[PDB]
Ligand binder design. Structure first.
Ligand code: NAG
Lengths: 238, 192
């Protein structure tokens, strides 16, 4: 499909950033769009045959490039807090424009507030098992910032999608704070016969996106790099 | 530019939904409806022609002189819940509208509301309260105390048994917290 790298990024105001997008094989046209929660999709630039074809009325700090392999890169210099947005790439043969996952860019004044989540799973109650013949595990991630994590359920070492529901919107822990940390919850429901088997293993995995070894850290706490925080539970007869 | 309904739309499952969109450039060669999930990217849903278009439960209408374009969803399902984007293609640059969010409430077959306590598996007192199996009409209000947290309703679909259930999670660091005082606005759950 359409590749976009990196997937997530954190940066301070005034830095330069470089996003890259590989189109579908055989697609020559590559277009960039910006998506802010306050605004909608806004065109940035389209590229065909290494040339900027159409501009989108964006400041020149939003640079763009394209190479002979139809891969396209775009830079954002002099980063500002209002640049925090999803930068989508779209490919086309040149009529249908296929979008990539997008690059999530967060701009901050402080690197100080980036925190990894704490994860915990909570075992199904016996009352639900008795009256519904079903068992709901509940995963909870707390205290992370910026609110950009990916939650997944792994049963016996294999990821599962059926029987899963995660919150679309992370919860603000202290809504009044402008620098509040976030929380997220998810549910995995199975039959009571499944949970009662003690050889079954359940795990909630929370991929948090933070810094990297490129970034500098000068705080008491460990550097909150991108990481995987997990919690687990075993099946219980009763 | 492109103007469409602010939304959100909130409709029962199986309801017919209509989407409304207007635009300035009447000569644009192509018109599209795109779909977008919350944590995802736009995806083409249907092309729209002057004769309209039809694809399963989706239909679309276009009137260039009136600058009008419409989408119609029949027998709306939970999977249809998403933001629908009206897209115009004057030369090659897609112009998206702000989009209209659509939420489809599942019809709970056998409601059995209850608030259960779920213990932490890492040998601790920590617990969460699961409000579950309630009908889709009741609205889970957000917490009114600073240190209790209540998630918005999440609709779970166990396709293996063709089963669907609403759920909301509550938890607090307060030591006065109990599962029987965590939620507000319920029906008659089994508050064991
Ligand atoms: C639909 O659009 C027309 C014009 O485009 C407008 O007059 C009408 O109020 C709209 N209806 C809704 C429900 O948005």
């Amino acid at each position: 499909g359409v590749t976009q790298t990196p997937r997530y990024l954190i940066k301070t105001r005034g830095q330069q950033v470089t996003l890259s997008c590989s189109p579908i094989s055989g697609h020559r046209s590559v277009s960039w769009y910006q998506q802010t929660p306050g605004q909608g999709l806004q065109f940035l630039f389209e590229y065909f045959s290494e040339t900027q074809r159409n501009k989108g009325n964006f400041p020149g700090r939003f640079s763009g490039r394209q190479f002979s392999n139809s891969r396209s890169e775009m830079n954002v210099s002099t980063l500002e807090l209002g640049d925090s947005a999803l930068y989508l790439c779209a490919s086309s043969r040149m009529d249908t424009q296929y979008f990539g996952p997008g690059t999530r860019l967060t701009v901050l004044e402080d690197l100080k507030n980036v925190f990894p989540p704490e994860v915990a799973v909570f075992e199904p109650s016996k009352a639900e098992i008795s009256r519904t013949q079903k068992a709901t595990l509940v995963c909870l991630a707390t205290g992370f910032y910026p609110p950009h994590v990916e939650l997944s359920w792994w049963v016996n070492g294999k990821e599962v999608h059926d029987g899963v529901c995660t919150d679309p919107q992370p919860l603000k822990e202290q809504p009044a704070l402008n620098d509040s940390r976030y929380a997220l919850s998810s549910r995995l429901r199975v039959s009571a016969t499944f949970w009662q088997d003690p050889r079954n293993h359940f795990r909630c995995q929370v991929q948090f996106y933070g810094l990297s070894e490129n970034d500098e850290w000068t705080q008491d706490r460990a550097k909150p790099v991108t990481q995987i925080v997990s919690a687990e539970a075993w099946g219980r007869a009763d | 530019e492109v103007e469409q309904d602010p939304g959100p739309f909130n409709v029962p499952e199986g309801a017919t939904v209509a989407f409304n969109c207007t635009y300035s450039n009447s000569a644009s060669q192509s018109f599209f409806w795109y779909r977008q999930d919350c944590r995802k990217e736009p995806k083409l849903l249907m092309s729209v022609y002057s004769s309209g278009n039809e694809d399963g439960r989706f239909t679309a209408q276009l009137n260039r002189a009136s600058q009008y374009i419409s989408l119609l969803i029949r027998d709306s399902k939970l999977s249809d819940s998403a933001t629908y984007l009206c897209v115009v293609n004057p030369h090659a640059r897609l112009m998206f509208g702000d989009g209209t969010q659509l939420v489809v409430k599942p019809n709970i077959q056998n409601p059995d509301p209850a608030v259960y306590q779920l213990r932490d598996s890492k040998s601790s007192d920590k617990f969460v309260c699961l409000f579950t199996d309630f009908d889709s009409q009741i609205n889970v209000s957000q917490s009114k105390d600073s240190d209790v947290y209540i998630t918005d309703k999440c609709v779970l679909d166990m396709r293996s048994m063709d089963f669907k259930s609403n759920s909301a999670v509550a938890w607090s660091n307060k030591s006065d917290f109990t599962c029987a005082n965590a939620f507000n606005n319920s029906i008659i759950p089994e508050d064991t």
